[PDB]
Symmetry: C2
Subunit: 253 residues, 2 copies
Protein backbone atom coordinates (compact mmCIF):
# COMPACT_ATOMS: atom_id res chain seq x y z
CA UNK A 1 0.00 0.00 0.00
CA UNK A 2 3.11 2.12 0.41
CA UNK A 3 4.88 3.65 -2.56
CA UNK A 4 8.65 3.37 -2.36
CA UNK A 5 10.97 6.29 -1.94
CA UNK A 6 14.58 6.46 -2.65
CA UNK A 7 16.48 9.40 -1.48
CA UNK A 8 20.11 10.09 -2.21
CA UNK A 9 22.04 12.19 0.38
CA UNK A 10 24.99 13.82 -1.34
CA UNK A 11 26.23 15.07 1.93
CA UNK A 12 29.06 17.52 1.61
CA UNK A 13 29.69 16.98 -2.00
CA UNK A 14 28.98 19.23 -5.00
CA UNK A 15 29.80 21.96 -7.49
CA UNK A 16 27.91 23.38 -10.39
CA UNK A 17 29.81 21.27 -12.76
CA UNK A 18 28.85 18.26 -10.77
CA UNK A 19 25.33 19.50 -10.23
CA UNK A 20 25.01 19.49 -13.96
CA UNK A 21 26.82 16.21 -14.80
CA UNK A 22 24.95 14.24 -12.32
CA UNK A 23 21.41 15.68 -12.69
CA UNK A 24 21.81 15.13 -16.44
CA UNK A 25 22.94 11.56 -15.86
CA UNK A 26 20.22 10.81 -13.30
CA UNK A 27 17.66 11.97 -15.80
CA UNK A 28 18.81 9.70 -18.44
CA UNK A 29 19.31 6.64 -16.21
CA UNK A 30 16.17 7.34 -14.53
CA UNK A 31 14.11 7.37 -17.64
CA UNK A 32 11.41 4.74 -17.62
CA UNK A 33 11.00 4.43 -13.88
CA UNK A 34 7.56 5.06 -12.57
CA UNK A 35 7.08 2.75 -9.75
CA UNK A 36 9.52 4.57 -7.50
CA UNK A 37 9.66 7.93 -5.86
CA UNK A 38 13.02 9.59 -6.13
CA UNK A 39 14.45 12.53 -4.28
CA UNK A 40 17.89 14.16 -3.97
CA UNK A 41 19.48 16.31 -1.22
CA UNK A 42 22.34 18.39 -2.25
CA UNK A 43 24.15 21.09 -0.38
CA UNK A 44 21.94 24.04 0.40
CA UNK A 45 23.62 26.29 -2.11
CA UNK A 46 22.95 23.85 -4.79
CA UNK A 47 19.33 23.22 -4.27
CA UNK A 48 18.07 25.95 -6.55
CA UNK A 49 20.32 25.14 -9.42
CA UNK A 50 19.60 21.49 -8.99
CA UNK A 51 15.86 22.22 -9.30
CA UNK A 52 16.62 23.93 -12.60
CA UNK A 53 18.65 21.06 -13.71
CA UNK A 54 16.01 18.51 -12.79
CA UNK A 55 13.27 20.46 -14.50
CA UNK A 56 11.47 18.26 -16.82
CA UNK A 57 12.08 15.03 -14.83
CA UNK A 58 10.47 13.29 -11.90
CA UNK A 59 13.46 13.75 -9.64
CA UNK A 60 12.22 15.51 -6.45
CA UNK A 61 14.23 17.93 -4.24
CA UNK A 62 15.19 17.64 -0.54
CA UNK A 63 17.52 19.07 2.08
CA UNK A 64 20.01 17.80 4.61
CA UNK A 65 18.83 19.81 7.52
CA UNK A 66 16.97 22.82 9.07
CA UNK A 67 17.11 25.08 12.12
CA UNK A 68 14.15 26.14 14.36
CA UNK A 69 13.45 29.73 13.22
CA UNK A 70 11.40 30.68 10.27
CA UNK A 71 12.86 34.13 9.95
CA UNK A 72 14.49 36.76 12.18
CA UNK A 73 17.88 37.56 13.54
CA UNK A 74 19.49 34.20 13.09
CA UNK A 75 22.59 34.57 11.08
CA UNK A 76 23.46 31.40 9.28
CA UNK A 77 20.40 29.45 10.35
CA UNK A 78 18.33 27.36 7.78
CA UNK A 79 14.57 28.29 7.54
CA UNK A 80 11.91 25.70 6.60
CA UNK A 81 9.97 28.55 5.24
CA UNK A 82 12.81 29.14 2.92
CA UNK A 83 13.04 25.52 2.06
CA UNK A 84 9.38 25.59 1.11
CA UNK A 85 10.08 28.65 -0.95
CA UNK A 86 13.05 27.01 -2.59
CA UNK A 87 10.98 24.02 -3.75
CA UNK A 88 12.66 21.49 -1.48
CA UNK A 89 10.21 18.83 -0.24
CA UNK A 90 12.08 16.08 1.79
CA UNK A 91 14.13 17.30 4.77
CA UNK A 92 16.60 15.09 6.42
CA UNK A 93 16.77 15.42 10.17
CA UNK A 94 18.64 13.74 12.95
CA UNK A 95 21.07 12.31 10.42
CA UNK A 96 23.48 10.30 12.47
CA UNK A 97 26.33 12.52 11.45
CA UNK A 98 24.72 15.62 13.02
CA UNK A 99 23.75 13.77 16.06
CA UNK A 100 27.43 13.01 16.30
CA UNK A 101 29.24 15.86 14.74
CA UNK A 102 26.80 18.32 15.91
CA UNK A 103 25.40 16.94 19.06
CA UNK A 104 21.85 17.33 17.98
CA UNK A 105 19.43 16.06 20.64
CA UNK A 106 16.26 14.07 20.25
CA UNK A 107 14.45 17.12 21.57
CA UNK A 108 16.06 19.27 19.15
CA UNK A 109 15.39 16.93 16.39
CA UNK A 110 11.86 16.65 17.57
CA UNK A 111 11.43 20.33 17.47
CA UNK A 112 12.78 20.21 13.92
CA UNK A 113 10.01 17.80 13.12
CA UNK A 114 7.20 19.94 14.46
CA UNK A 115 8.30 22.78 12.33
CA UNK A 116 8.56 21.01 9.06
CA UNK A 117 5.26 19.53 9.73
CA UNK A 118 3.95 23.01 10.40
CA UNK A 119 5.02 24.29 6.95
CA UNK A 120 3.77 21.28 5.35
CA UNK A 121 7.14 19.74 4.48
CA UNK A 122 8.07 16.08 4.58
CA UNK A 123 10.50 15.23 7.31
CA UNK A 124 12.80 12.34 6.85
CA UNK A 125 13.57 11.25 10.27
CA UNK A 126 16.66 9.71 10.86
CA UNK A 127 17.06 7.18 13.78
CA UNK A 128 19.20 4.13 14.81
CA UNK A 129 21.84 2.71 17.17
CA UNK A 130 25.54 3.05 18.00
CA UNK A 131 28.00 0.05 17.90
CA UNK A 132 27.77 -0.16 21.67
CA UNK A 133 23.98 0.01 22.03
CA UNK A 134 23.69 -2.59 19.37
CA UNK A 135 26.18 -4.81 21.13
CA UNK A 136 24.45 -4.21 24.41
CA UNK A 137 21.23 -5.30 22.72
CA UNK A 138 19.63 -1.93 22.98
CA UNK A 139 18.28 -1.38 19.44
CA UNK A 140 14.61 -1.06 20.32
CA UNK A 141 15.29 0.90 23.56
CA UNK A 142 17.00 3.50 21.48
CA UNK A 143 14.82 3.43 18.47
CA UNK A 144 11.70 3.90 20.43
CA UNK A 145 13.42 6.49 22.46
CA UNK A 146 14.27 8.31 19.30
CA UNK A 147 10.75 8.10 18.04
CA UNK A 148 8.96 9.00 21.20
CA UNK A 149 10.62 12.32 21.07
CA UNK A 150 7.88 13.15 18.45
CA UNK A 151 5.06 10.76 19.37
CA UNK A 152 5.06 11.68 22.99
CA UNK A 153 4.98 15.36 22.49
CA UNK A 154 3.31 15.62 19.13
CA UNK A 155 1.09 12.62 18.67
CA UNK A 156 0.76 9.83 16.17
CA UNK A 157 -0.64 12.28 13.62
CA UNK A 158 2.74 13.95 13.42
CA UNK A 159 3.50 10.92 11.41
CA UNK A 160 1.07 11.51 8.66
CA UNK A 161 2.95 11.81 5.40
CA UNK A 162 6.13 11.36 7.38
CA UNK A 163 9.13 9.28 6.60
CA UNK A 164 11.48 7.39 8.91
CA UNK A 165 15.02 6.33 8.09
CA UNK A 166 16.85 3.56 9.98
CA UNK A 167 20.59 4.04 10.21
CA UNK A 168 22.40 1.09 11.58
CA UNK A 169 25.29 3.29 12.77
CA UNK A 170 26.82 0.16 14.16
CA UNK A 171 27.16 -1.49 10.77
CA UNK A 172 28.45 1.64 9.26
CA UNK A 173 32.20 1.97 9.07
CA UNK A 174 32.89 -0.88 11.36
CA UNK A 175 33.45 -3.98 9.32
CA UNK A 176 30.03 -4.89 10.41
CA UNK A 177 27.20 -5.67 8.02
CA UNK A 178 23.46 -5.91 8.48
CA UNK A 179 21.42 -8.53 6.73
CA UNK A 180 18.08 -8.09 5.18
CA UNK A 181 16.46 -10.13 8.05
CA UNK A 182 18.01 -7.83 10.49
CA UNK A 183 16.77 -4.67 9.07
CA UNK A 184 13.28 -5.86 8.24
CA UNK A 185 13.17 -6.93 11.88
CA UNK A 186 13.95 -3.48 13.06
CA UNK A 187 11.58 -2.06 10.53
CA UNK A 188 8.71 -4.10 11.89
CA UNK A 189 9.59 -2.88 15.38
CA UNK A 190 9.41 0.68 14.27
CA UNK A 191 6.09 0.18 12.54
CA UNK A 192 4.78 -1.79 15.36
CA UNK A 193 5.79 0.85 17.93
CA UNK A 194 3.65 3.46 16.20
CA UNK A 195 0.98 0.93 15.69
CA UNK A 196 0.56 0.48 19.47
CA UNK A 197 -0.63 4.02 19.35
CA UNK A 198 -2.14 4.51 15.91
CA UNK A 199 -2.42 1.70 13.58
CA UNK A 200 -3.71 3.43 10.59
CA UNK A 201 -0.96 6.05 10.67
CA UNK A 202 1.54 3.16 11.21
CA UNK A 203 0.45 1.52 7.85
CA UNK A 204 1.34 4.60 5.99
CA UNK A 205 4.74 5.61 7.27
CA UNK A 206 7.62 5.28 4.86
CA UNK A 207 10.35 3.43 6.61
CA UNK A 208 13.46 3.60 4.52
CA UNK A 209 16.52 1.59 5.06
CA UNK A 210 19.40 3.99 5.87
CA UNK A 211 22.17 1.48 5.94
CA UNK A 212 24.49 0.52 3.12
CA UNK A 213 22.76 -0.45 -0.09
CA UNK A 214 24.37 -1.79 -3.27
CA UNK A 215 23.37 -3.81 -6.29
CA UNK A 216 24.06 -7.10 -4.60
CA UNK A 217 21.61 -6.28 -1.80
CA UNK A 218 19.04 -3.72 -3.07
CA UNK A 219 16.71 -6.31 -4.21
CA UNK A 220 17.00 -8.62 -1.21
CA UNK A 221 16.48 -5.43 0.68
CA UNK A 222 13.36 -4.19 -0.92
CA UNK A 223 11.77 -7.55 -0.57
CA UNK A 224 11.09 -6.96 3.09
CA UNK A 225 7.49 -5.89 3.73
CA UNK A 226 8.49 -3.18 6.18
CA UNK A 227 11.24 -1.66 4.06
CA UNK A 228 9.81 1.07 1.93
CA UNK A 229 12.97 2.33 0.39
CA UNK A 230 16.41 3.65 1.08
CA UNK A 231 18.10 6.76 2.20
CA UNK A 232 21.20 6.48 0.01
CA UNK A 233 24.57 7.95 0.72
CA UNK A 234 27.71 7.72 -1.32
CA UNK A 235 26.01 5.98 -4.20
CA UNK A 236 23.74 8.88 -4.76
CA UNK A 237 26.92 10.40 -6.27
CA UNK A 238 27.28 7.88 -9.14
CA UNK A 239 24.22 8.06 -11.48
CA UNK A 240 24.31 4.46 -12.67
CA UNK A 241 24.59 2.99 -9.21
CA UNK A 242 21.99 5.23 -7.91
CA UNK A 243 19.50 4.25 -10.53
CA UNK A 244 19.94 0.57 -9.90
CA UNK A 245 19.09 1.05 -6.24
CA UNK A 246 16.13 2.69 -7.70
CA UNK A 247 14.91 0.18 -10.14
CA UNK A 248 15.30 -2.53 -7.50
CA UNK A 249 12.79 -0.69 -5.35
CA UNK A 250 10.45 -0.23 -8.29
CA UNK A 251 10.90 -3.83 -9.17
CA UNK A 252 10.53 -5.00 -5.64
CA UNK A 253 7.81 -3.12 -3.91
CA UNK B 1 44.10 54.72 2.75
CA UNK B 2 40.93 52.70 3.44
CA UNK B 3 38.12 52.24 1.00
CA UNK B 4 34.80 51.63 2.83
CA UNK B 5 32.85 48.42 2.86
CA UNK B 6 29.27 48.29 3.56
CA UNK B 7 28.03 44.81 4.02
CA UNK B 8 24.35 43.89 4.60
CA UNK B 9 23.64 40.87 6.71
CA UNK B 10 20.19 39.76 5.61
CA UNK B 11 20.15 37.25 8.40
CA UNK B 12 17.17 34.83 8.58
CA UNK B 13 15.22 36.71 5.85
CA UNK B 14 14.71 36.03 2.14
CA UNK B 15 12.66 34.43 -0.69
CA UNK B 16 12.96 34.11 -4.51
CA UNK B 17 10.57 37.03 -4.66
CA UNK B 18 12.36 39.27 -2.02
CA UNK B 19 15.66 38.50 -3.54
CA UNK B 20 14.28 39.55 -6.84
CA UNK B 21 12.85 42.79 -5.68
CA UNK B 22 15.52 43.93 -3.14
CA UNK B 23 18.36 43.27 -5.55
CA UNK B 24 16.68 45.25 -8.33
CA UNK B 25 16.09 47.99 -5.91
CA UNK B 26 19.65 47.87 -4.71
CA UNK B 27 20.87 47.88 -8.28
CA UNK B 28 19.04 51.12 -8.95
CA UNK B 29 19.76 52.90 -5.70
CA UNK B 30 23.51 52.00 -5.96
CA UNK B 31 23.92 52.55 -9.67
CA UNK B 32 25.77 55.90 -9.28
CA UNK B 33 27.76 55.20 -6.09
CA UNK B 34 31.53 55.28 -6.65
CA UNK B 35 33.65 55.04 -3.56
CA UNK B 36 32.06 52.48 -1.36
CA UNK B 37 32.28 48.80 -1.71
CA UNK B 38 29.19 46.75 -1.23
CA UNK B 39 28.36 43.23 -0.36
CA UNK B 40 25.24 41.31 0.59
CA UNK B 41 24.69 38.04 2.41
CA UNK B 42 21.50 36.22 1.68
CA UNK B 43 20.38 32.91 3.17
CA UNK B 44 22.65 30.24 1.73
CA UNK B 45 20.05 28.92 -0.57
CA UNK B 46 19.53 32.49 -2.17
CA UNK B 47 23.11 33.26 -2.98
CA UNK B 48 23.24 31.74 -6.41
CA UNK B 49 20.07 33.47 -7.32
CA UNK B 50 21.28 36.69 -5.91
CA UNK B 51 24.57 36.40 -7.56
CA UNK B 52 22.58 36.05 -10.76
CA UNK B 53 20.53 39.12 -9.92
CA UNK B 54 23.62 41.07 -9.19
CA UNK B 55 25.33 40.49 -12.56
CA UNK B 56 26.10 43.84 -14.12
CA UNK B 57 26.37 45.73 -10.77
CA UNK B 58 29.16 46.13 -8.28
CA UNK B 59 27.15 44.46 -5.65
CA UNK B 60 29.27 41.74 -4.22
CA UNK B 61 28.27 38.51 -2.63
CA UNK B 62 28.48 37.10 0.81
CA UNK B 63 27.55 34.24 3.20
CA UNK B 64 26.41 34.09 6.81
CA UNK B 65 28.82 31.34 8.03
CA UNK B 66 30.87 28.24 6.96
CA UNK B 67 31.86 25.01 8.52
CA UNK B 68 35.22 23.28 8.66
CA UNK B 69 34.97 20.67 6.16
CA UNK B 70 35.61 21.11 2.43
CA UNK B 71 33.92 17.80 1.39
CA UNK B 72 32.79 14.40 2.59
CA UNK B 73 30.34 12.91 5.00
CA UNK B 74 28.97 15.76 6.81
CA UNK B 75 25.37 15.94 6.17
CA UNK B 76 24.14 19.51 6.70
CA UNK B 77 27.51 21.34 6.59
CA UNK B 78 28.82 24.20 4.49
CA UNK B 79 31.95 24.20 2.53
CA UNK B 80 34.12 27.08 1.89
CA UNK B 81 34.87 25.61 -1.46
CA UNK B 82 31.22 25.46 -2.43
CA UNK B 83 30.92 28.97 -1.18
CA UNK B 84 33.77 29.92 -3.54
CA UNK B 85 32.17 27.94 -6.39
CA UNK B 86 28.85 29.54 -6.00
CA UNK B 87 30.29 33.03 -6.05
CA UNK B 88 30.36 34.27 -2.45
CA UNK B 89 33.35 36.43 -1.42
CA UNK B 90 32.75 37.79 2.02
CA UNK B 91 31.87 35.32 4.75
CA UNK B 92 30.57 36.10 8.18
CA UNK B 93 32.30 34.21 10.92
CA UNK B 94 31.79 34.54 14.68
CA UNK B 95 28.68 36.64 14.63
CA UNK B 96 27.32 37.23 18.06
CA UNK B 97 24.28 35.20 17.31
CA UNK B 98 26.46 32.15 16.58
CA UNK B 99 28.72 32.50 19.53
CA UNK B 100 25.50 32.94 21.63
CA UNK B 101 22.97 30.63 19.82
CA UNK B 102 25.21 27.98 18.38
CA UNK B 103 27.71 28.29 21.18
CA UNK B 104 30.44 28.90 18.66
CA UNK B 105 33.86 29.37 20.30
CA UNK B 106 37.08 31.26 19.66
CA UNK B 107 38.93 28.08 18.67
CA UNK B 108 36.35 27.06 16.09
CA UNK B 109 36.10 30.65 14.82
CA UNK B 110 39.86 30.94 14.30
CA UNK B 111 39.70 27.58 12.53
CA UNK B 112 36.96 28.77 10.28
CA UNK B 113 38.97 31.81 9.57
CA UNK B 114 41.84 29.60 8.60
CA UNK B 115 39.98 27.54 6.09
CA UNK B 116 38.58 30.70 4.50
CA UNK B 117 42.03 31.89 3.75
CA UNK B 118 43.40 28.61 2.36
CA UNK B 119 40.53 29.06 -0.01
CA UNK B 120 40.81 32.62 -1.09
CA UNK B 121 37.75 34.02 0.58
CA UNK B 122 37.64 37.13 2.61
CA UNK B 123 36.73 36.36 6.19
CA UNK B 124 34.48 38.77 8.04
CA UNK B 125 35.53 38.30 11.64
CA UNK B 126 32.92 39.41 14.17
CA UNK B 127 33.83 40.25 17.70
CA UNK B 128 32.48 42.11 20.69
CA UNK B 129 31.62 41.89 24.29
CA UNK B 130 28.52 41.31 26.33
CA UNK B 131 26.64 43.40 28.64
CA UNK B 132 28.13 41.46 31.48
CA UNK B 133 31.68 41.95 30.09
CA UNK B 134 31.28 45.51 29.00
CA UNK B 135 29.86 46.36 32.46
CA UNK B 136 32.98 44.90 33.95
CA UNK B 137 34.97 47.03 31.57
CA UNK B 138 36.43 43.89 30.06
CA UNK B 139 36.03 45.49 26.65
CA UNK B 140 39.53 45.37 25.29
CA UNK B 141 40.30 42.28 27.27
CA UNK B 142 37.53 40.45 25.44
CA UNK B 143 38.15 41.92 22.03
CA UNK B 144 41.77 41.22 22.31
CA UNK B 145 41.14 37.54 23.10
CA UNK B 146 38.80 37.08 20.16
CA UNK B 147 41.39 38.74 17.95
CA UNK B 148 44.36 36.78 19.26
CA UNK B 149 42.69 33.49 18.60
CA UNK B 150 43.71 34.10 14.93
CA UNK B 151 46.58 36.43 15.71
CA UNK B 152 48.50 34.36 18.20
CA UNK B 153 48.14 31.34 16.13
CA UNK B 154 48.04 32.41 12.49
CA UNK B 155 49.97 35.70 12.47
CA UNK B 156 49.27 39.31 11.44
CA UNK B 157 49.34 38.25 7.82
CA UNK B 158 46.27 36.27 8.55
CA UNK B 159 44.50 39.63 8.68
CA UNK B 160 46.06 40.56 5.41
CA UNK B 161 43.25 41.38 3.02
CA UNK B 162 40.79 40.55 5.85
CA UNK B 163 37.82 42.22 7.60
CA UNK B 164 36.93 42.56 11.22
CA UNK B 165 33.61 43.80 12.61
CA UNK B 166 33.17 44.86 16.12
CA UNK B 167 29.71 44.04 17.52
CA UNK B 168 28.66 46.03 20.64
CA UNK B 169 26.87 43.03 22.06
CA UNK B 170 26.11 44.65 25.37
CA UNK B 171 24.26 47.25 23.35
CA UNK B 172 21.88 44.85 21.55
CA UNK B 173 18.45 44.91 23.11
CA UNK B 174 20.00 45.78 26.34
CA UNK B 175 18.73 49.25 26.22
CA UNK B 176 22.07 50.84 25.62
CA UNK B 177 23.45 52.80 22.75
CA UNK B 178 27.09 53.19 21.80
CA UNK B 179 28.19 56.63 20.77
CA UNK B 180 30.37 57.06 17.71
CA UNK B 181 32.99 58.11 20.20
CA UNK B 182 32.72 55.00 22.30
CA UNK B 183 32.86 52.94 19.19
CA UNK B 184 35.79 54.63 17.63
CA UNK B 185 37.83 53.92 20.67
CA UNK B 186 37.35 50.28 20.25
CA UNK B 187 37.99 50.34 16.64
CA UNK B 188 41.29 51.96 17.36
CA UNK B 189 42.22 49.65 20.08
CA UNK B 190 41.53 46.93 17.74
CA UNK B 191 43.68 48.55 15.22
CA UNK B 192 46.65 49.17 17.64
CA UNK B 193 46.50 45.62 19.04
CA UNK B 194 47.20 44.29 15.57
CA UNK B 195 49.65 47.08 15.16
CA UNK B 196 51.84 45.72 17.92
CA UNK B 197 52.44 42.72 15.71
CA UNK B 198 52.52 44.55 12.32
CA UNK B 199 51.37 48.12 11.96
CA UNK B 200 51.47 47.71 8.20
CA UNK B 201 48.84 45.02 8.23
CA UNK B 202 47.09 47.20 10.73
CA UNK B 203 46.34 50.19 8.62
CA UNK B 204 45.27 47.84 5.90
CA UNK B 205 42.44 46.20 7.88
CA UNK B 206 38.85 46.99 7.41
CA UNK B 207 37.04 47.45 10.71
CA UNK B 208 33.39 47.76 10.20
CA UNK B 209 31.10 48.85 12.96
CA UNK B 210 28.64 46.09 13.72
CA UNK B 211 26.47 47.79 16.32
CA UNK B 212 23.17 49.24 15.23
CA UNK B 213 23.35 51.22 12.06
CA UNK B 214 20.63 52.97 10.04
CA UNK B 215 19.76 55.83 7.70
CA UNK B 216 20.23 58.39 10.44
CA UNK B 217 23.14 56.68 12.19
CA UNK B 218 25.60 56.24 9.35
CA UNK B 219 27.00 59.74 8.99
CA UNK B 220 27.97 60.13 12.73
CA UNK B 221 29.84 56.85 12.48
CA UNK B 222 31.62 57.05 9.18
CA UNK B 223 33.07 60.23 10.57
CA UNK B 224 35.30 58.28 13.01
CA UNK B 225 38.68 57.55 11.49
CA UNK B 226 38.74 54.01 12.70
CA UNK B 227 35.41 52.96 11.38
CA UNK B 228 35.76 51.94 7.80
CA UNK B 229 32.36 50.55 7.12
CA UNK B 230 29.48 48.68 8.47
CA UNK B 231 27.98 45.31 8.76
CA UNK B 232 24.27 46.08 8.64
CA UNK B 233 21.37 44.23 9.93
CA UNK B 234 17.80 45.37 9.75
CA UNK B 235 18.59 48.13 7.30
CA UNK B 236 19.88 45.92 4.58
CA UNK B 237 16.40 44.62 4.01
CA UNK B 238 15.49 48.17 2.83
CA UNK B 239 17.19 49.43 -0.28
CA UNK B 240 16.68 53.08 0.35
CA UNK B 241 17.90 52.87 3.93
CA UNK B 242 20.74 50.65 2.89
CA UNK B 243 21.70 52.88 0.07
CA UNK B 244 21.85 56.00 2.31
CA UNK B 245 24.17 54.07 4.57
CA UNK B 246 26.38 53.22 1.60
CA UNK B 247 26.41 56.83 0.33
CA UNK B 248 27.43 58.04 3.75
CA UNK B 249 30.44 55.81 3.80
CA UNK B 250 31.17 57.18 0.29
CA UNK B 251 30.86 60.80 1.44
CA UNK B 252 32.71 60.27 4.82
CA UNK B 253 35.70 58.63 3.32
CA UNK B 254 35.92 60.85 0.26
CA UNK B 255 38.75 63.12 1.18
Amino acid sequence: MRHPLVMGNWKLNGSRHMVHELVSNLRKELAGVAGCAVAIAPPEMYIDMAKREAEGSHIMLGAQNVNLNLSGAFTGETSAAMLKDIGAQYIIIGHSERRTYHKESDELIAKKFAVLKEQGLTPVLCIGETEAENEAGKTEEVCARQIDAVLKTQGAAAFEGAVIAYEPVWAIGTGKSATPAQAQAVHKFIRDHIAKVDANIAEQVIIQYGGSVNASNAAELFAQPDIDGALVGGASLKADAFAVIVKAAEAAK
